[PDB]
């Protein structure tokens, strides 16, 4: 293509996309190196597919997983949102590190590094304990509480390496580091899922209707990701440009979906916490009621999963945009909404805009998370071909927001001049 | 009657979002399907490659 030819003629961006591809190879070789002492025979045989009460897998299921990178950068995601939730007036070491400047922010990032390595350690312990406790009665040889620690520190050292090459590819490769790594952790499962969809085989009619439903939902998700309520802003402190155009006027781009994907991530966490605590008590009469009502594929599980998505995307939208901090930030340095008194009234204005625009991205995200059950029922795919959810929302997000960052080097190359 | 005004102004403020229009929308869908196809094929190839090299390294 005439633009990918541009991308692989100019020197530095060709070197950095080749560096990105080499680091994805260094990533994906580590999924074949396993945890050092686990009985990997029981790991591969354990296939308790779906529609089971106990196993109501979400994102595809980490069943034939458990390599050294298998903890993922999900500890870093949850530790980073914990410290983001804690900067908001709680524990004011972080509040003073936030308000002081950016070399305090380095100590804040270092706190986040150590809190990730802690949660990676204890969640590797919890994962291996659960994943030997029911998926296979025996999975670690020489089993016992003294030997979970070696494989848990192997997993934690692994995702420490994964965050390491994340920041190496964001320094030297193309775009975001760990977003390209998560994109490589999602899109590297589609080869097996094409094998399973083909190996199943409304012979072709069903698959053609499926592929155009996938392209229809991917254009819906681009249409909702790439949209802005451009609030017009106006800095009072310079002379309005003496004869401006008004076409590129300073604005303040509120996203339609300010919360990102994160509210559905901790919606599945609060979904599967009560079955995994009621699984300890033993099979009672209420435990089977619990796993019937928190199976998210049945129309009480879908409804409470939807209501948790709506609630956490309202909450996390207000923690993400934060209308009080942005109105105080606007009147702290100049600008104001044209017509709106820049103290309290500009925060109530951007609060009301933020409610009425969070509703749309809210029910968008609810529908994009309850889509994959509505394809597995109504299209008879293998019930691990779960298209939709976070794995859709962040494949298209990482793909676009590194395409843009990639081709914003060419405009540096292509200055013209009037002479020619 | 707070809901019957609220959803009305939700529909009103959907008329003020700067939505992406059809030209760069089709450009974006071409881009994202190109990257998912290339990375699917690339990951399939390197998984086959390191599979068939590890299975002789054992």
């Amino acid at each position, epitope marked *: 293509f005439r633009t990918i030819s541009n991308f692989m003629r100019v020197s530095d961006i060709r070197n950095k996309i080749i560096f990105t591809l080499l680091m994805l190879i260094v990533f994906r070789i580590g999924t074949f190196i*396993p945890v050092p002492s686990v009985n990997t*025979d029981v790991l*591969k*045989l354990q*296939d308790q597919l779906n529609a089971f009460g106990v196993l109501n897998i979400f994102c595809g299921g980490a069943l034939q997983n458990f390599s050294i990178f298998a903890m993922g950068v999900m500890p870093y995601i949850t530790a980073s949102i914990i410290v983001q939730l804690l900067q908001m007036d709680v524990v004011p070491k972080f509040a003073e590190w936030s308000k002081q400047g950016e070399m305090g922010r380095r100590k804040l990032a270092q706190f986040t590094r150590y809190f990730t390595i802690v949660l990676g350690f204890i969640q590797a312990l919890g994962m291996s304990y659960g994943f030997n406790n029911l998926a296979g*009665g*025996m999975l670690i040889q020489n089993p016992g509480i003294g030997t979970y620690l070696l494989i848990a520190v192997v997993l934690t050292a692994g995702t420490a390496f994964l965050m390491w090459l994340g920041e190496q590819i964001t320094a030297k490769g193309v775009g975001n580091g760990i977003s390209i790594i998560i994109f490589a952790g999602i899109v590297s499962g589609i080869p097996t899922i094409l094998n399973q969809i083909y190996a199943q085989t409304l012979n072709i009619v069903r698959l053609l209707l499926v592929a155009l439903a996938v392209v229809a939902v991917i254009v819906g998700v681009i249409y909702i990701q790439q949209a802005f309520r451009k609030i017009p802003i106006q800095y009072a402190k310079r002379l309005e440009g003496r004869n401006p155009v008004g076409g590129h006027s300073t604005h303040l781009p509120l996203k339609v979906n300010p919360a990102g994907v994160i509210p559905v991530i901790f919606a599945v966490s609060f979904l599967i916490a009560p079955p995994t605590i009621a699984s300890f008590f033993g099979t009672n009469d209420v435990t089977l009621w619990i796993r019937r009502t928190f199976d998210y594929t049945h129309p009480v599980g879908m409804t409470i999963y939807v209501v948790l998505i709506i609630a956490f995307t309202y909450f996390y939208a207000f923690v993400q945009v934060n209308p009080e901090q942005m109105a105080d930030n606007l009147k702290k340095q100049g600008g104001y909404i044209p017509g709106i008194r820049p103290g309290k009234n500009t925060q109530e204005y951007v609060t009301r805009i933020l409610y009425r625009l969070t509703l749309v991205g809210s029910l968008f995200l609810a529908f994009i998370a309850v889509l994959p059950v509505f394809f597995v029922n109504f299209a008879n795919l293998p019930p691990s071909a779960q298209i939709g959810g976070t794995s859709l929302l962040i494949v298209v997000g990482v793909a676009l927001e590194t395409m843009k960052q990639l081709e914003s080097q060419l405009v540096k190359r292509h200055y013209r001049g009037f002479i020619k | 009657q707070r809901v019957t005004n609220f959803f009305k102004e939700v529909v009103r403020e959907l008329k003020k979002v700067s939505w992406p229009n059809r030209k760069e929308l089709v450009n974006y869908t071409a881009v994202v399907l190109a990257t998912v196809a290339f990375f699917t094929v690339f990951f399939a190839v390197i998984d086959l490659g390191i599979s068939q090299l590890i299975r002789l390294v*054992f």
Partner: nanobody, 116 residues
Framework: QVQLVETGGGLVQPGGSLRLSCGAS????????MGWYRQAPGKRREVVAR???????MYPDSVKGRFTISRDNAKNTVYLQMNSLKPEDTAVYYC???????????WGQGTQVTVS
């Protein structure tokens, strides 16, 4: 790669004993993991017996101790001796092998042990 047969399973009352002998065709056999799993309806399919190169016998929490696994070369056979049977174990049984680490652990056919 190796052809694999499983004998000794059949019809038995709950409270008896059985002897599953799994014999192979390919004769090198010094491998990673030999085992035994079910895949009854209700799938779950659980490794019932597991034996490594050290013959470090591993058993799950439901059938711990009552069974034993025995390896021999000079006739490539593993032995799942079964004692004090129970009506829940009405299942097909399977004897699986695996050469090195992961290297796709291959199955066999099974013997449908009926117990009720």
């Amino acid at each position: 790669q190796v052809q694999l047969v499983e004998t000794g399973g059949g019809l038995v009352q709950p409270g008896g004993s059985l002897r599953l002998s799994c014999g192979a065709s390919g004769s090198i056999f010094n491998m990673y993991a030999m085992g035994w799993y079910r895949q009854a309806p209700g799938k779950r399919r659980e490794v019932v017996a597991r034996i490594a190169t050290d013959d470090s016998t591993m058993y799950p929490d439901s059938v711990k101790g009552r069974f034993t696994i025995s390896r021999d070369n000079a006739k490539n056979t593993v032995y799942l001796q079964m004692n004090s049977l129970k009506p829940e174990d009405t299942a097909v049984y399977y004897c699986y092998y695996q050469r090195t680490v992961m290297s796709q652990p291959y199955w066999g056919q099974g013997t449908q042990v009926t117990v009720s």
